Amino acid sequence: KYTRGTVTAFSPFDARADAEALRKAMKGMGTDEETILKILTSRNNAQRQEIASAFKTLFGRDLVDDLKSELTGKFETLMVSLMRPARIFDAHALKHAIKGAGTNEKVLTEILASRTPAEVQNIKQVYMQEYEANLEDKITGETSGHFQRLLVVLLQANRDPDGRVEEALVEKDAQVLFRAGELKWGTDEETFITILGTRSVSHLRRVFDKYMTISGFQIEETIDRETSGDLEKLLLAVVKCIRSVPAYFAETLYYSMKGAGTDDDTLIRVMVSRSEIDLLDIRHEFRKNFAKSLYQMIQKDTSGDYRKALLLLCGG
Ligand SMILES: [Ca+2]
Ligand SMILES: [Ca+2]
């Protein structure tokens, strides 16, 4: 319950020697895409931030700008995502899932359902600092309904603390989800939003066990994934992050490749975001749950340099 990542600090690290090798790779006609990917997937984000700085000191050019202008396609996206400061990554993804016409409900849900209260608290903050707006005013302007109210509950980064579990309560709560389950998460929404958004994790895992003993089914079993509802999808992402974040992302990754095509926007966002948190645990849930390794699914769904950088990120 000690999460491991797939990317560690490279050594021996020489930011100046790394910046000089990237310049050369990009300098002139064409590009050496392979020196680029070898450096970027074997340096962690802090290190990358230090290569960016060195690069700006030595040539008076911007590394990202240069990647952007030299690279192309998904390889470009991947590399540019690797380069984004970890501190801003989430705030940035949220600015774009929201900005423009429509909304990307998907990023909304993934990030709010999966990040820790501390991580939500940091995001709200970097967002205010960088974009100048209040995260909350925005979500609230793009979404509506119970969907909207559950994201706001989640944005308070206020779930109860893991202490004493009172079984009576565990018991009261199970009886109400049981009932809403039967109702197709159709009503008394206000009540199950209160329960799922605010109770501690230890208290809700207990609730789900209890729930299973009343009904004979697991709470997620009472909601179709593939089909609709934005709130349903958000309820589902919460339930699963409550039991295991790594399992939730393994499954997220699996559905980004199963069937014709790939949701490359999700493949990349996840691979990058969790590369230094729980990407190894995720690879483990994927294999136990999917019967395939992340590596082989990715080998098969992607191609080229985009594919080799992803496989280096992945690790085995
Ligand atoms: Ca060039
Ligand atoms: Ca929008």
Ligand SMILES: [Ca+2]
């Ligand atoms: Ca596919």
